[PDB]
JSON list of C-alpha atoms in Angstrom, two decimals:
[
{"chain": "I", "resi": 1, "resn": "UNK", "atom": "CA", "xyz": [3.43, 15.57, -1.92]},
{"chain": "I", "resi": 2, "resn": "UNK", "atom": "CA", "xyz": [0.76, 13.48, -3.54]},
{"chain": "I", "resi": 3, "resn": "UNK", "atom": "CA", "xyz": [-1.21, 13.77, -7.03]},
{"chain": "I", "resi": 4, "resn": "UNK", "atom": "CA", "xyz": [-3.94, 11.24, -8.53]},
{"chain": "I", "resi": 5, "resn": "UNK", "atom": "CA", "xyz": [-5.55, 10.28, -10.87]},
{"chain": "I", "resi": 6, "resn": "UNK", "atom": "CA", "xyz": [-8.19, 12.53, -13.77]},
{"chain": "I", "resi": 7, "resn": "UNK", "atom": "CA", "xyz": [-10.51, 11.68, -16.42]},
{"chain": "I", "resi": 8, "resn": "UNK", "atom": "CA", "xyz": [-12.05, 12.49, -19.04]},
{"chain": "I", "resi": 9, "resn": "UNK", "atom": "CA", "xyz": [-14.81, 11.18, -21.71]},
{"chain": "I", "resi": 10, "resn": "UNK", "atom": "CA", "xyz": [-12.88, 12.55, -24.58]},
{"chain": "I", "resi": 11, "resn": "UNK", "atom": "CA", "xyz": [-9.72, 14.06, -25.37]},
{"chain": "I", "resi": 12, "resn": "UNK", "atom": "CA", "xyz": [-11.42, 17.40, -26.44]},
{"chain": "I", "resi": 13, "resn": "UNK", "atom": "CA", "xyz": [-13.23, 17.75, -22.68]},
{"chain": "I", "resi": 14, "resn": "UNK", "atom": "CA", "xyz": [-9.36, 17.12, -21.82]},
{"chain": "I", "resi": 15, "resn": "UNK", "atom": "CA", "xyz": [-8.12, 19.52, -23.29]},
{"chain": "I", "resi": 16, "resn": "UNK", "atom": "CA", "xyz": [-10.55, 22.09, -22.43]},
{"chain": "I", "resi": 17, "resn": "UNK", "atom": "CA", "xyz": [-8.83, 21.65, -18.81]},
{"chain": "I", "resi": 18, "resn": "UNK", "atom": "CA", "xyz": [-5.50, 20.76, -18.84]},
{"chain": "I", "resi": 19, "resn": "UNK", "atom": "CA", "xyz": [-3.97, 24.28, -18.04]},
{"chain": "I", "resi": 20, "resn": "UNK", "atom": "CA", "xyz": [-5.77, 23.65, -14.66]},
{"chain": "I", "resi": 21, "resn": "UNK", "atom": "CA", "xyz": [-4.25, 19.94, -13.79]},
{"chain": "I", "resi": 22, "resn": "UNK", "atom": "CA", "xyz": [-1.26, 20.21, -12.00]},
{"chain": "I", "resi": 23, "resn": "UNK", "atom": "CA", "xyz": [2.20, 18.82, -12.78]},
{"chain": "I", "resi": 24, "resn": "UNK", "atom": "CA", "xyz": [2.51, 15.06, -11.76]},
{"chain": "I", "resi": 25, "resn": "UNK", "atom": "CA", "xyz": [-1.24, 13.96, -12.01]},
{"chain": "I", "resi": 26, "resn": "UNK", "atom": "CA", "xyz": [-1.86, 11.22, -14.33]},
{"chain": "I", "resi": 27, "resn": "UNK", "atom": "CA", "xyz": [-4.59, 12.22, -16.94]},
{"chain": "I", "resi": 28, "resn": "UNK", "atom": "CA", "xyz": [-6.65, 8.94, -19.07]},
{"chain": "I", "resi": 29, "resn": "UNK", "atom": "CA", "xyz": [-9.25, 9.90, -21.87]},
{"chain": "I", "resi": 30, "resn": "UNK", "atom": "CA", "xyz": [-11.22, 7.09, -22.62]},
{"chain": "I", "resi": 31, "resn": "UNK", "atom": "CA", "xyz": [-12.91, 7.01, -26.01]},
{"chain": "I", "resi": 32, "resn": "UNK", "atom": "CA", "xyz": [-8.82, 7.47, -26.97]},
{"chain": "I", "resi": 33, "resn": "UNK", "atom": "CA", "xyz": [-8.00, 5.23, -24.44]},
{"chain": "I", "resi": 34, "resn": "UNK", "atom": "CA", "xyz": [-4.76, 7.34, -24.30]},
{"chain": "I", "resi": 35, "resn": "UNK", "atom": "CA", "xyz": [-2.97, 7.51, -21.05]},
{"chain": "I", "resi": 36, "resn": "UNK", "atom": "CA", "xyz": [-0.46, 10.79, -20.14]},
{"chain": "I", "resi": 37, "resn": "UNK", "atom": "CA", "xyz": [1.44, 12.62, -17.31]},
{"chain": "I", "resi": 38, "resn": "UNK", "atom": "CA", "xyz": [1.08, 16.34, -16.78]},
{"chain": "I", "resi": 39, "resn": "UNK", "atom": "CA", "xyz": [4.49, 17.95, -16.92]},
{"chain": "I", "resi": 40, "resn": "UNK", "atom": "CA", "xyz": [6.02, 21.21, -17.00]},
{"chain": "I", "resi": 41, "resn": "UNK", "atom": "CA", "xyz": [4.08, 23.42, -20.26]},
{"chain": "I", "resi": 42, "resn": "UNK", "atom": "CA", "xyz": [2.55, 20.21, -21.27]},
{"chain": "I", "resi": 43, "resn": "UNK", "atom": "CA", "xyz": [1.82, 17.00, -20.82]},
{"chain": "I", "resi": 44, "resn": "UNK", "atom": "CA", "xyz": [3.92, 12.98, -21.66]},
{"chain": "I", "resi": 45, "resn": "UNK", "atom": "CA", "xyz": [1.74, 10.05, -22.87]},
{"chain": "I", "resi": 46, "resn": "UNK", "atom": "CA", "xyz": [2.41, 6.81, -21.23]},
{"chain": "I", "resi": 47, "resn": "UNK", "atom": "CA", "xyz": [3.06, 4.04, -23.79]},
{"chain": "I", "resi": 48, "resn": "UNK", "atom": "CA", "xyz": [0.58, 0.91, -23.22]},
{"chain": "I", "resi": 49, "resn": "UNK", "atom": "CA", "xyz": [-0.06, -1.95, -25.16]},
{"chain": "I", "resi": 50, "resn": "UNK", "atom": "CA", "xyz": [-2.69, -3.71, -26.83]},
{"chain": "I", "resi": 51, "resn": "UNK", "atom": "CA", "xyz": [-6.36, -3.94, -24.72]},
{"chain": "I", "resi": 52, "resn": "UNK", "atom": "CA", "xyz": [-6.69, -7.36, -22.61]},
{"chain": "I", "resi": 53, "resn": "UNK", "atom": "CA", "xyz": [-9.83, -8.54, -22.68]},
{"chain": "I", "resi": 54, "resn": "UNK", "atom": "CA", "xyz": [-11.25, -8.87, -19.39]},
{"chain": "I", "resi": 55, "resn": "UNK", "atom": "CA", "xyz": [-11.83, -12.55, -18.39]},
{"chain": "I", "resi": 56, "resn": "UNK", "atom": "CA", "xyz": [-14.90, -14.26, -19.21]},
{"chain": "A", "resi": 1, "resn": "UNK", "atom": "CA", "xyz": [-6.51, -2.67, -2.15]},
{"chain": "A", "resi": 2, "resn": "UNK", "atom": "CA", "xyz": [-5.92, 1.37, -3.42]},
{"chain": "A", "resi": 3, "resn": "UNK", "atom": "CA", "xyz": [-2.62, 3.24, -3.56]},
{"chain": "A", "resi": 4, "resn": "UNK", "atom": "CA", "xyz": [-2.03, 6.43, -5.60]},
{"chain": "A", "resi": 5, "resn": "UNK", "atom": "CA", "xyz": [0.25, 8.54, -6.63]},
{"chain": "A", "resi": 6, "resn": "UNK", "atom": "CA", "xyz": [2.72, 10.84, -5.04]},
{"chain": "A", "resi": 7, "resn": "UNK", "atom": "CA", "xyz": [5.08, 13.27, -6.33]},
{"chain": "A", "resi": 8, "resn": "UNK", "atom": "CA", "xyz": [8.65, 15.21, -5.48]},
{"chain": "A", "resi": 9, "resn": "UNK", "atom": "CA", "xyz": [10.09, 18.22, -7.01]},
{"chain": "A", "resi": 10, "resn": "UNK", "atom": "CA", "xyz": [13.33, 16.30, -7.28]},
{"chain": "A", "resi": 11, "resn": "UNK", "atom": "CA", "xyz": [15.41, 13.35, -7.56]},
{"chain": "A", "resi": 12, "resn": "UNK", "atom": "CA", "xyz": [17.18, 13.73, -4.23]},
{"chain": "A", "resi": 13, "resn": "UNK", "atom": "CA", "xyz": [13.68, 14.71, -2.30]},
{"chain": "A", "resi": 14, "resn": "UNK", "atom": "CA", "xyz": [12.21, 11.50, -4.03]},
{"chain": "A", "resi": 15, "resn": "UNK", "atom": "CA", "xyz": [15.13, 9.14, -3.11]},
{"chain": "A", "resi": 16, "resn": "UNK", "atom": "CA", "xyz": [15.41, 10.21, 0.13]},
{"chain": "A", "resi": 17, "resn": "UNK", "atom": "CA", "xyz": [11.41, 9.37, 0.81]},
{"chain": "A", "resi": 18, "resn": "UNK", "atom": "CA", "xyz": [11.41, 6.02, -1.50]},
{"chain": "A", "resi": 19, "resn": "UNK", "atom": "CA", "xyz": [11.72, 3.90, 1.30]},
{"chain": "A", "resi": 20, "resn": "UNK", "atom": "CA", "xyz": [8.77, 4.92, 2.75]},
{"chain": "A", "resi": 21, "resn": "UNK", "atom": "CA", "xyz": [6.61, 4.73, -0.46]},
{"chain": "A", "resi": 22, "resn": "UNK", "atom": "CA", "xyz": [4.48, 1.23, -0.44]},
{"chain": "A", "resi": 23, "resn": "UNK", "atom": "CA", "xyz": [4.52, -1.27, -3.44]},
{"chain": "A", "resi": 24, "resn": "UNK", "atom": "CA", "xyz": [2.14, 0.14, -6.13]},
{"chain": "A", "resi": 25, "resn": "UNK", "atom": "CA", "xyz": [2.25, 3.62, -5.82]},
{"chain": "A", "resi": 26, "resn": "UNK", "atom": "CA", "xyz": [3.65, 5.92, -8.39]},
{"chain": "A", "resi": 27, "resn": "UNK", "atom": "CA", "xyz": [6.18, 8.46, -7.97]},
{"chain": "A", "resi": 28, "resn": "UNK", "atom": "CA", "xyz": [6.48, 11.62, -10.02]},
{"chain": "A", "resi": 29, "resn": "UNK", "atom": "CA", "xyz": [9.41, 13.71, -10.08]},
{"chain": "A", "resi": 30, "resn": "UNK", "atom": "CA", "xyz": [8.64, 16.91, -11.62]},
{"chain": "A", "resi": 31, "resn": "UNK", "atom": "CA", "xyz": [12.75, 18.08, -12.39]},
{"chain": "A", "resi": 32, "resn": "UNK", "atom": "CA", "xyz": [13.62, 15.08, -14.47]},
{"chain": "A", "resi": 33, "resn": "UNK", "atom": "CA", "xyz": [9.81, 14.88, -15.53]},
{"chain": "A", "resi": 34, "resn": "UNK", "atom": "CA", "xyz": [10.07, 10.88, -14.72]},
{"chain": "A", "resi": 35, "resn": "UNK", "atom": "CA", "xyz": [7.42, 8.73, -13.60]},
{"chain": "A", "resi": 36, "resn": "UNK", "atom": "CA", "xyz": [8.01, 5.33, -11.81]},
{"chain": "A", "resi": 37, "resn": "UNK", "atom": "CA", "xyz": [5.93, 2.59, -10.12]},
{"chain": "A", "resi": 38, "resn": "UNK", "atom": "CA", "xyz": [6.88, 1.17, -6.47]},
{"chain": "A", "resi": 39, "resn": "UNK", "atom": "CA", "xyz": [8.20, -2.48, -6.49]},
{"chain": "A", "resi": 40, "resn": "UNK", "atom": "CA", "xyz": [9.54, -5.21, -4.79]},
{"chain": "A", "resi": 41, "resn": "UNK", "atom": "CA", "xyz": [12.89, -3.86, -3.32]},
{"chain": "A", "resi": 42, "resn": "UNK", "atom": "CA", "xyz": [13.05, -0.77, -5.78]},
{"chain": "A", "resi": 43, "resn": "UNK", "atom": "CA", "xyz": [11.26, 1.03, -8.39]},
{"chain": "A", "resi": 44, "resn": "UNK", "atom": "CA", "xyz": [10.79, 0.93, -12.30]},
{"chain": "A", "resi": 45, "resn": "UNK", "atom": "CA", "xyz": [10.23, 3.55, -14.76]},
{"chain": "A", "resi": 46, "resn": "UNK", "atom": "CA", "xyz": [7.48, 4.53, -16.62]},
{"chain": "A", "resi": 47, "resn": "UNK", "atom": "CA", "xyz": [8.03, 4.89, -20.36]},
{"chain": "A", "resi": 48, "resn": "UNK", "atom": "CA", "xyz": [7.35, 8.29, -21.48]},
{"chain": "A", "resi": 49, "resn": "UNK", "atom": "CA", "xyz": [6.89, 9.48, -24.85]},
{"chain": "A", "resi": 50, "resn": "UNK", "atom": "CA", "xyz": [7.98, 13.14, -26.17]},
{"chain": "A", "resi": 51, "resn": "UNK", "atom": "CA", "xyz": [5.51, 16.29, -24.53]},
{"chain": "A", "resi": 52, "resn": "UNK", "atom": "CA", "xyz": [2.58, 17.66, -26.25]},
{"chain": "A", "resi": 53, "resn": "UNK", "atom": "CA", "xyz": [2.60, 21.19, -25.70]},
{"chain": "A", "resi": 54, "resn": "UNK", "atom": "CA", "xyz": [-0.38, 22.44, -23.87]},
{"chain": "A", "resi": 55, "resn": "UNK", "atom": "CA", "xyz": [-3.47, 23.73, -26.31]},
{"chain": "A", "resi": 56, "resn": "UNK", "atom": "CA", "xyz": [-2.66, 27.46, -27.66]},
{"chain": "T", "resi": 1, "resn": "UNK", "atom": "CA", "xyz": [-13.35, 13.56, -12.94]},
{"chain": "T", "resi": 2, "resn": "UNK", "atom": "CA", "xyz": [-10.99, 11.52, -10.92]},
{"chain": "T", "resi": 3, "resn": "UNK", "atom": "CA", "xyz": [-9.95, 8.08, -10.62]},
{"chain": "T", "resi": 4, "resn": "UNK", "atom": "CA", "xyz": [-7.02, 6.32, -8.85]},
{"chain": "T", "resi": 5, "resn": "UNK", "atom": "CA", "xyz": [-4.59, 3.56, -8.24]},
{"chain": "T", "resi": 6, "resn": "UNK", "atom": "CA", "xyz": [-6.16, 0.30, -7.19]},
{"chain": "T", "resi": 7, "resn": "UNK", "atom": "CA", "xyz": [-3.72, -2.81, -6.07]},
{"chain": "T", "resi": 8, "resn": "UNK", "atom": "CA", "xyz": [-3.39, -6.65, -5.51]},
{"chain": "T", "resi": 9, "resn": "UNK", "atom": "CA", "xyz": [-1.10, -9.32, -4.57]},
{"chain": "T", "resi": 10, "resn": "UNK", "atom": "CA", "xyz": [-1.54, -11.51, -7.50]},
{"chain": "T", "resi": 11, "resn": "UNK", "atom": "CA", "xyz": [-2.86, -11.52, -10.59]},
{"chain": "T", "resi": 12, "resn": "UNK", "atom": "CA", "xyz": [-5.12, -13.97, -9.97]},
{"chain": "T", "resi": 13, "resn": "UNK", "atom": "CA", "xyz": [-6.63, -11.55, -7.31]},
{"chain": "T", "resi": 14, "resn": "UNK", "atom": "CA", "xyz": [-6.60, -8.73, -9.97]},
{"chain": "T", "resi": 15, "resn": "UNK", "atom": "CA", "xyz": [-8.72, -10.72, -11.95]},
{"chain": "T", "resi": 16, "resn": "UNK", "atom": "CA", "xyz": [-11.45, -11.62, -9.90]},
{"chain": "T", "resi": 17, "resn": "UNK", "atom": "CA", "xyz": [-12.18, -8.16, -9.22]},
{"chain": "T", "resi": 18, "resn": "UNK", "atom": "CA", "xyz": [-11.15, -6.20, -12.69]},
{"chain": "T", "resi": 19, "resn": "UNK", "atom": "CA", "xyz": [-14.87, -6.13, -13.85]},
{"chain": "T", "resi": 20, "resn": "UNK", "atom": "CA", "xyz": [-15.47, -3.57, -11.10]},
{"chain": "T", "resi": 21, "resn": "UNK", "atom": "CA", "xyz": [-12.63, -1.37, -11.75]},
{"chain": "T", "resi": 22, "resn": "UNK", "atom": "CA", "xyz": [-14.03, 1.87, -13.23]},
{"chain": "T", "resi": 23, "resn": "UNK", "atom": "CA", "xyz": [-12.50, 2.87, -16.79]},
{"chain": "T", "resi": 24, "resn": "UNK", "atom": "CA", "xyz": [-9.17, 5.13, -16.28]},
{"chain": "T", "resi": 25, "resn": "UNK", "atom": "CA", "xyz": [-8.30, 3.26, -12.84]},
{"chain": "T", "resi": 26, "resn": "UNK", "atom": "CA", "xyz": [-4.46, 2.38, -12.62]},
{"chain": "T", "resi": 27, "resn": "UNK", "atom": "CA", "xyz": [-4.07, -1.07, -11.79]},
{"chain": "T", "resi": 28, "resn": "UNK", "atom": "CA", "xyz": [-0.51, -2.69, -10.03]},
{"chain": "T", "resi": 29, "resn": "UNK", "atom": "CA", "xyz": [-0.05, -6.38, -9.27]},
{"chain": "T", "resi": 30, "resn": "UNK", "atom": "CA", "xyz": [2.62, -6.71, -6.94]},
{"chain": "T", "resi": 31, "resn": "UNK", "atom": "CA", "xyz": [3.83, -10.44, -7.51]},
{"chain": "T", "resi": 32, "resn": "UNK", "atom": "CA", "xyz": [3.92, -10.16, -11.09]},
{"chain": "T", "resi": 33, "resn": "UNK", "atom": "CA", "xyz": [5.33, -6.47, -10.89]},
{"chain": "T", "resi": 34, "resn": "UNK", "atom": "CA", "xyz": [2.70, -5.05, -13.79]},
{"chain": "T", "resi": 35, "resn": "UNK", "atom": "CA", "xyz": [0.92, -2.05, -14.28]},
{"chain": "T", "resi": 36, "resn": "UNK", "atom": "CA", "xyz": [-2.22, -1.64, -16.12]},
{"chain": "T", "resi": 37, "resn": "UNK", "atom": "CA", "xyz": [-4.71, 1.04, -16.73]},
{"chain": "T", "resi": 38, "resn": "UNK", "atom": "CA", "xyz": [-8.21, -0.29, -17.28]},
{"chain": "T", "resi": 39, "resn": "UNK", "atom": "CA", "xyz": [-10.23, 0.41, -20.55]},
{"chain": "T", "resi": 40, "resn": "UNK", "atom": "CA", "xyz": [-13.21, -0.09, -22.06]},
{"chain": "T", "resi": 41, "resn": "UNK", "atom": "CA", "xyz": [-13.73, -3.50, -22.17]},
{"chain": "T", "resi": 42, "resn": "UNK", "atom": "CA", "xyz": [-10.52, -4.39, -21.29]},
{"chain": "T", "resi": 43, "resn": "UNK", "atom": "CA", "xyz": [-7.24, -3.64, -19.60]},
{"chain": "T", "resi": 44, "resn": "UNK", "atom": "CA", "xyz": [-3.53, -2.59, -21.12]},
{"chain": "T", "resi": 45, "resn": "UNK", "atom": "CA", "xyz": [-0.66, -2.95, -19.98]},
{"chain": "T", "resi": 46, "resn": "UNK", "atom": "CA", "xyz": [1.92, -0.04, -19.31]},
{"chain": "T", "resi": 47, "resn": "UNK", "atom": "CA", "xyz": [5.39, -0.78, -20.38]},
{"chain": "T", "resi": 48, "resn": "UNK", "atom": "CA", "xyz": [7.82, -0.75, -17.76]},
{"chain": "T", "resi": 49, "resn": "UNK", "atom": "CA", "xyz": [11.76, -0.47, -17.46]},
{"chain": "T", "resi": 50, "resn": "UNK", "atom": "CA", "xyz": [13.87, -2.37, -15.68]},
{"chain": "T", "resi": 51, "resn": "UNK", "atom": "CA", "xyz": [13.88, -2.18, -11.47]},
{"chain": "T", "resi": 52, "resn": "UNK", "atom": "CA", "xyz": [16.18, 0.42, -9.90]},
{"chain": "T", "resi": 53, "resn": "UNK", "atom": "CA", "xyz": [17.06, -0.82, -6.71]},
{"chain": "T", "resi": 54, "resn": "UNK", "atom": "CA", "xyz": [16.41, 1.96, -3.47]},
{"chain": "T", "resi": 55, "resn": "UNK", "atom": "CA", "xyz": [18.94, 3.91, -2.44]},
{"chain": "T", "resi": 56, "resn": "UNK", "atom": "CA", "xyz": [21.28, 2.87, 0.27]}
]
């Protein structure tokens, strides 16, 4: 099957929704800037590292 | 270019299809709760931290 | 809300174009083998394990 990709502005919109994204879609918040996986009963956060600027 | 992200109940539905999946896609499999990215000649695992539970 | 996965050969490529990648896009470069998700103002990099070859 396939899944994708959701967003949100804030984690609090996020969360407001997340019983309705399914298991396997991706899920970024961006004033966080927190990245996580929906799973079964919950959901995994993706480890990233520090922001790259982008190029000038 | 755009790829995605597509998703198996399993390990042995997912291996069996991996072949098929182009570089840069990611691959969910919701039994071990794992996510991976496409490569070169394989695939490499997405690090994962502990689940949140979902909002009571 | 949705996003996506976008790809490129090279970083180099990825580069030139990362200004127009929407906030909460994943981002793959094949030659390098990285994976990024794009932020405000920035990108970060997702950490990665090592490649598991495809099954034979």
């Amino acid at each position: 099957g396939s899944s994708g990709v959701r967003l949100w502005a804030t984690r609090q919109a996020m969360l407001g929704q997340v019983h309705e994204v399914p298991e396997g879609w991706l899920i970024f918040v961006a004033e966080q800037e927190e990245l996580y996986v929906r799973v079964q009963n919950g959901f995994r956060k993706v480890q990233l590292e520090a922001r790259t600027p982008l190029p000038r």
